[PDB]
Amino acid sequence: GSIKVAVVVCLLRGQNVLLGRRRLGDSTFSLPSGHLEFGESFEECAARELKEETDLDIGKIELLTVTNNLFPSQYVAVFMRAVLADPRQEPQNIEPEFCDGWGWYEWDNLPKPLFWPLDNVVQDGFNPFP
């Protein structure tokens, strides 16, 4: 019965956020997320997750919020927003075992179904854009 910390990233470019289709939460749309690794800052975790999942290099990583998500496991999800270090770059599906693909979505028109921990914060008015 373990408590785990995930870092979830709202990678923003213009009016769009990056979402991928997951392969917990199979085939729902979700933000880049992953487990905080010991020694990591939230920002380092966010950057590593994006690099590992999409090969994207992100920057201006900023804390947004944190949520509590119960499953034998409980995830404290730390939400960060970021931008691309080079906005000309596009995500590459580097981990097809965990993701079917990446896309840019407008916050006003998110895809469905969202991974339920993400729907939960969207339901609460979560908005990563400044």
Side-chain angles (χ1 to χ4, degrees):
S2 48
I3 291 156
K4 297 176 200 136
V5 181
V7 176
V8 176
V9 186
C10 297
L11 182 58
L12 311 179
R13 191 174 62 189
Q15 50 186 350
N16 292 314
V17 58
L18 188 74
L19 297 185
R21 184 169 219 132
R22 279 176 77 81
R23 273 202 62 199
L24 311 166
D26 224 18
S27 321
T28 65
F29 293 78
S30 190
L31 299 162
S33 65
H35 299 12
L36 182 67
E37 290 176 3
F38 185 83
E40 286 192 313
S41 70
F42 297 149
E43 296 86 353
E44 286 182 308
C45 182
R48 168 175 63 72
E49 294 179 353
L50 263 297
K51 199 87 177 253
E52 294 184 346
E53 298 171 9
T54 70
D55 201 39
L56 288 170
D57 293 272
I58 71 178
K60 298 178 184 154
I61 309 165
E62 303 177 325
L63 173 71
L64 291 179
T65 192
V66 59
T67 65
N68 175 45
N69 312 266
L70 304 125
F71 292 82
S73 70
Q74 189 171 345
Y75 281 82
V76 175
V78 176
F79 287 71
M80 317 290 284
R81 69 170 171 233
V83 296
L84 281 176
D86 178 1
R88 309 171 291 171
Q89 305 294 337
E90 291 293 336
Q92 275 206 86
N93 193 354
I94 298 321
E95 292 179 333
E97 66 256 48
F98 299 136
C99 182
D100 289 340
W102 296 97
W104 298 101
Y105 303 82
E106 290 197 351
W107 199 247
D108 44 280
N109 168 26
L110 287 174
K112 288 302 272 147
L114 300 165
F115 187 34
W116 70 258
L118 173 54
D119 193 68
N120 195 33
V121 311
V122 175
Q123 286 183 336
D124 294 353
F126 176 72
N127 181 11
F129 295 80

